Write a protein that binds this DNA or RNA. Structure first.
Lengths: 108, 203
RNA sequence: AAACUUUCAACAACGGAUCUCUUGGUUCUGGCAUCGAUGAAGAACGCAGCGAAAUGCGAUAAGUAAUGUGAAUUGCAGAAUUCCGUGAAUCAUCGAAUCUUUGAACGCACAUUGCGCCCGCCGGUAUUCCGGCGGGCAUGCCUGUUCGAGCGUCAU
RNA sequence: ACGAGAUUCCCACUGUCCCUAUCUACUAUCUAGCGAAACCACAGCCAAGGGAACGGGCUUGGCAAAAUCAGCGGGGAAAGA
RNA sequence: AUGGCCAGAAAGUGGUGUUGACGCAAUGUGAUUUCUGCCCAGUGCUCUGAAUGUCAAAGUGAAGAAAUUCAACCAAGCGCG
RNA sequence: CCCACCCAUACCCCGCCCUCAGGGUAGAAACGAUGCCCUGAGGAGUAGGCGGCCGUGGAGGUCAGUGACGAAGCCUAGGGCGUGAGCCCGGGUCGAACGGCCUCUAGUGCAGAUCUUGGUGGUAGUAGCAAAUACUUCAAUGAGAACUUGAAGGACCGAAGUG
RNA sequence: GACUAAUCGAACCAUCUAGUAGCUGGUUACCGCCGAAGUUUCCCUCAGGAUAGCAGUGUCGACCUUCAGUUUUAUGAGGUAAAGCGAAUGAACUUUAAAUAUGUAAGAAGCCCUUGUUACUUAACUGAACGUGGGCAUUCGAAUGUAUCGACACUAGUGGGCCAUUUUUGGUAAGCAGAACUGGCGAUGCGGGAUGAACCGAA
RNA sequence: CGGGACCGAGGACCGCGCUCUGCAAGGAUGCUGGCGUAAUGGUCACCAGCGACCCGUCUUGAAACACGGACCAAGGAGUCAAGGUUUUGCGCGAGUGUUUGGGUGUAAAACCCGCACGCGUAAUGAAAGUGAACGUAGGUGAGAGCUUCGGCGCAUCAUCGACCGAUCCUGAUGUAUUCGGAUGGAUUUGAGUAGGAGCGUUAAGCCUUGGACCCGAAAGAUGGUGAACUAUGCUUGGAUAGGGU
RNA sequence: CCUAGUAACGGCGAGUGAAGCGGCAACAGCUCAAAUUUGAAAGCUGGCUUCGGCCCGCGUUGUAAUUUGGAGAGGAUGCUUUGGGCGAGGCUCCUUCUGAGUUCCCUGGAACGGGACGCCACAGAGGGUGAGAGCCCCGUAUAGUUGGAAGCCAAGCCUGUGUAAAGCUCCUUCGACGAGUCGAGUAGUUUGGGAAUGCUGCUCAAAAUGGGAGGUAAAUUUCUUCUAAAGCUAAAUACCGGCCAGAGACCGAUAGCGCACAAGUAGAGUGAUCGAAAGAUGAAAAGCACUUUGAAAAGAGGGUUAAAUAGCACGUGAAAUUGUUGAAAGGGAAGCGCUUGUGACCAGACUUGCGCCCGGCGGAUCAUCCGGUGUUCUCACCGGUGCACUCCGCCGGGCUCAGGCCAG
């Protein structure tokens, strides 16, 4: 607003390579760490798994349906087996998943 | 980064007519619906998968059904656009899954279709009889025949006994091996010719 | 002391500020597609009982016909209107008309109200002369008709 | 030869002076009528001092009496400066 | 004169030109009288006289699988005389 | 060398204003707590920085707002409030609208720009109104006659003319 | 370089066009709270730049540690005055020691002791560096003062000006010209020097 | 022990005290007179004593010079948009943003809807690519607050460590025997991780680009209009006593 | 909208800058050339018509049917499809018509103002009428309701049926597909495509699973996508021109368009062009009869008006500047600050309040008790009770206190 300006108060006193035809869809691959992996599970079902009422069932999580292509390995996982379907995975992420007792499957 | 070094004030576009244009579009849609009653306002569209690896996880509506899809569904290509089915001749079916899904879509539409006779005093064999001509109808094929499951289900429960063993050696090592083989496909085949030629020479 | 100059006040001047107004601008939004050789846009010259302009109109000239409304117009003059009506009006609508000289402007020209040609009709004694009136006479191109030209190709 | 080209001198001639004087007409003047413009911070007497070499206003003195008319060209104004 | 000097965006375009060396065009000097300090050869003016020395494009040859590279030949002018 | 005296916005004491700082204020008889009470210190200012308030045109809400028994505007050697910008009232004039409070909004505040438009002064009843030889008498007309007319006189253009 | 409609070393008209200027002129109410600045250091200078410094608003941090254009003490520079040479020796002699201002240091965040390593050094486990553990709170180890803290953020002007005292370096016939500190002024009223940028008193 | 001047802030009590029926002790009362209106007070005009340059603007250090100002009324100059950055307020929060669009409407308002998308949630490398826990998300010294009084220790700072990507060196088990790159090192690097802080919006300050606070230049360019003046030329007209040689 | 100020281009850097995907608005598809109808040019312009047709011609150097790459042609095969004519009803555009006070009083020149009593409202938008009007007038809201024309949509219903055309399924075979064009070099220009862009000119100049593209030059071997050099087509999109309409936190006559007015007018310029100033009496002209003085303009009386302090110089009527009247000052400037004084002119303040003691009046909304009601649940109000030594007003006296200005 004009009435709040200082001017009303001051009235009276004055490298590397080139890539031709770059397509970002080639390099689209969003990543998620393992400490946010359980957040993809719905909240009630996730709370049942974390409490331990499901001792004979293993959740299958599709990262491509949630919008992620790569599973990264920052954080730690609980001792619950999880099936992870991902296009890419890091070595530490797969190691931590196998320590938790699951398996990382590769999809396209 | 201000691109104001041209004569920008001569082609500034404002949008004060946005609600008026919405009103005009709604009036045009109502007029189109009244002219097209009792047919739906839009045509039936197939379900297709988006190109590129960024968007190949999602399906959407395409332009029109393929000729092979119409032939498998039993609808002739000259009848199809006259009963509200969009037809595309450029698109082909490279796999059986999309073809079967669109054939099932066409069969559901044909089962729910009511075909009035051209002459009311002389109904035909392919024409819907008058005692089944009355029902509750729809006027939005984009709503009644939308993409029900655009993305794959992101969560699935399986028993702990049926957990797969996975790829031997690890998924990371499998990806690295695949990349290495893709990079070394040519050199190994070249040394394959070299070994074959050496064996033929010194057999 | 007065006059004069200056200061203050009241009233009167000069001038057109202020306030209020607003048949006007400015901006936005919605709707529509319709100029012209069947002569446009523009220009000129005229037209009212009494007008110079604006407005409207074209020698049928502030206008004609037709439809509707239904008693005016108004500055003066003068007439109304069988008011129980083919009907006032500077009224409205508008499908029928009129539409001067020009202008893409079209017989040739135009710094001229200049000069022609073709075909009819009428009047003056008029087969010959004179006058008036009416209808026409641009260019490029298309389709067709008709009249032609050329050892260009042939038949005979 | 010719030249509204530049220069020096001689004779004649004279108000250029020496040395100024006088006359006429039209103004200027006064009246009747009519009637602008330039310019204008405010104003107009001087002397000495007012560090920046400038005073019109300040300081200290001289002084200093209404309202005016014709002239004048020292300042101050005034040169499409 | 299939020319010179000009002009035009171009033109089946225009002028000089209804012209032809006692002519046309461009310069310099500027009536008449006087008048060419003496001699060259550095700059310049012009000689198709021999050279390929410089040597563009097009064209020619070689290498390679080709892109490409390397060679000669190389107009005028310049260079030499 | 000595005594007395003069006075600066300097120093001392007191009052009042503002700013800053330090305290108090609820089993609320309790307060524009964004208030009030108590105590101390300080006060120049260009460039520059910051805060609060005043005013103008318009908008939402509100004041059960003002008004032909007189709105707005204007004039006033008439008064009141505020440090101030300003606000309010009296009197005269006048004729149709206008204001207070909280928010919103801006084409929002002038002494200058050899500004811009319009209006008006001093100069000032002043400079001038002096080229082209020149006017005069009687009568008439008329409210009024140097510059209208008729007559009577005097002159000028001077035939490359004032034809 | 004359004329081409009062316009000519390139006419007039409209438009691009509200062309550009670093140069000139102007830039609109009040009160309150703060409040400045002229080689510090780097860059090739003029037709040059940044930058230090000095300021205001906000905040936040335990606004915690206290620090200080000052004196004293210890020790430097100035040993220079001075006293004596019945002390030695002879400003250059010394037992002792000037005035003016001036450098460094004056604690628990400190002082040592001990143990090792050293890639430092030393003839050297020797000094010292780095760690380790311990002793020192019995006074926290001069004076005076202390609404004086610290760190960010954002914003602004000025950053090779004038005058004066002192010190120092050069000079001129005489004038003077550089630096270093400090004070005043540009930004400032009051009292007195009759008067006034640079004087005195006092803000 | 006298003589004089100026001042009277506060507004029940409380306190320190004393000379203690009370008081000069945390700020003036008591008595009396005149008048009760222009008498006090105020405004305007004028005289008197003292005091007092004409305003901007510009310049440098400052004056002087210079430039503008005859007078009055009305306009009249840091605005708007886009994109940044810091701070204030607000909503939600590992998310956030309805308004391109759709629905709806009492119709440019308001209300409702969601896919995609933007920014954030991961970085580093020229790229291929790879990708953030040894530990109660570490040790030491501080540190508000709390404490069962032994300590626990927010934010933040210093310091030593740990992890991820880039660079260089070695090259393990294995093997398309030449692929793969484990492990151990060493330098810097990155607003990297190490118990998310962002997204939208409001207000203010500053840039950055646009005419960009307002008024101006000699200019440059595009397209048009003029030989009624004047210059030259062409066609067709007109005009110029009397003497001397 | 997003991609995205990104890929990319750029002296000495100022700067420039797309596209694919994704979401949405809107959706719509087709026509030729290249074939022999060859058992019949089946096609068409024009002229004359008795409206049956008949002629003059165009055209075989190709007018109809058929085919257009999604295919198609030929076969096989067995099923389906079709032409006309009414049409209820609906929509669009002009047309007739629509609710309620001029009730009473006051001010006023005039109520449309104030007060009272009503009424209408799917209408309290706007305007006019002598001042702010829902009900005075035009309109405004809503359903409809009169009359008329031209179109479009359309539920249904009558009839002909297969000479002909058309669709579906399968297939040995066939399956024509655009040339100075594509492409290459070079030049200019352009682009983010200054290695990957497009356009044009000159030169060269194609091919038949061929050709183009696949954003780094080239060769070889593959692969993926379309099918150029012929053509048509609504919608979503733009809109400082035109026509009709509705609006605004815009401007309110130096503003807003140059123009609210006989404005692109008057006027200037040879011309191209340039280009203003200027709105408001009053509700109604009721715009001053008549008398008188003047040559006249006008003046003065006297009317008109609610007002002439509104006189076609016209609403309001500032300032600069001027005239008169009144007051004052003035020995080569005025103007301003502090403080008196004089003259002129003013605003306040004050006029008495409160509390007692007597006397005289007028009344019982004194205290207690009972009932009802409300509340803060113990405080109140209301109705009966007071019978005048108790409460409340009024008037005469007296006393105390507080009251204005200047002073001792």
């Amino acid at each position: 607003p004009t009435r709040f300006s200082k001017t009303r108060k001051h009235r009276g006193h004055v490298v590397g390579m080139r890539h031709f035809h770059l397509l970002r869809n080639h390099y689209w691959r969003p990543s998620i760490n393992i400490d946010k992996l359980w957040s993809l599970v719905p909240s009630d079902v996730r709370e049942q798994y974390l409490s331990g009422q499901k001792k004979d069932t293993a959740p299958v999580i599709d990262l491509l349906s949630h919008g992620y292509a790569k599973l990264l390995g920052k954080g730690r996982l609980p001792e619950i087996p999880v099936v992870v379907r991902a296009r890419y995975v890091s070595a530490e992420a797969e190691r931590k998943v196998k320590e938790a007792g699951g398996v990382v499957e590769l999809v396209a | 980064n201000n691109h104001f070094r041209k004569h920008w004030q001569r082609r500034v576009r404002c949008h004060f007519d946005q609600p008026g244009k919405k009103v005009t579009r709604r009036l045009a849609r109502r007029a189109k619906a009244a002219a097209l009653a009792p047919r739906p306002v839009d045509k039936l569209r197939p379900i297709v998968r988006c190109p590129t690896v960024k968007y190949n996880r999602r399906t959407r509506l395409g332009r029109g059904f393929t000729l092979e899809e119409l032939k498998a569904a039993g609808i002739p290509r000259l009848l199809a656009p006259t009963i509200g089915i969009a037809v595309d001749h450029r698109r082909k079916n490279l796999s059986e899954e999309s073809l079967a899904a669109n054939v099932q879509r066409l069969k559901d539409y044909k089962a729910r279709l009511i075909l009035f006779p051209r002459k009311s005093n002389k109904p035909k064999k392919a024409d819907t009889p008058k005692d089944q001509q009355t029902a509750e109808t729809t006027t939005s094929l984009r709503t009644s025949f939308g993409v029900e499951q655009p993305l794959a289900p992101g969560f699935t429960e399986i028993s702990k006994s049926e957990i797969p063993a996975g790829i031997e050696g690890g998924a990371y090592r499998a990806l690295r091996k695949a990349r290495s083989d893709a990079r070394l496909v040519g050199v190994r085949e070249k040394r394959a010719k070299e070994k074959a030629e050496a064996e033929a020479n010194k057999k």
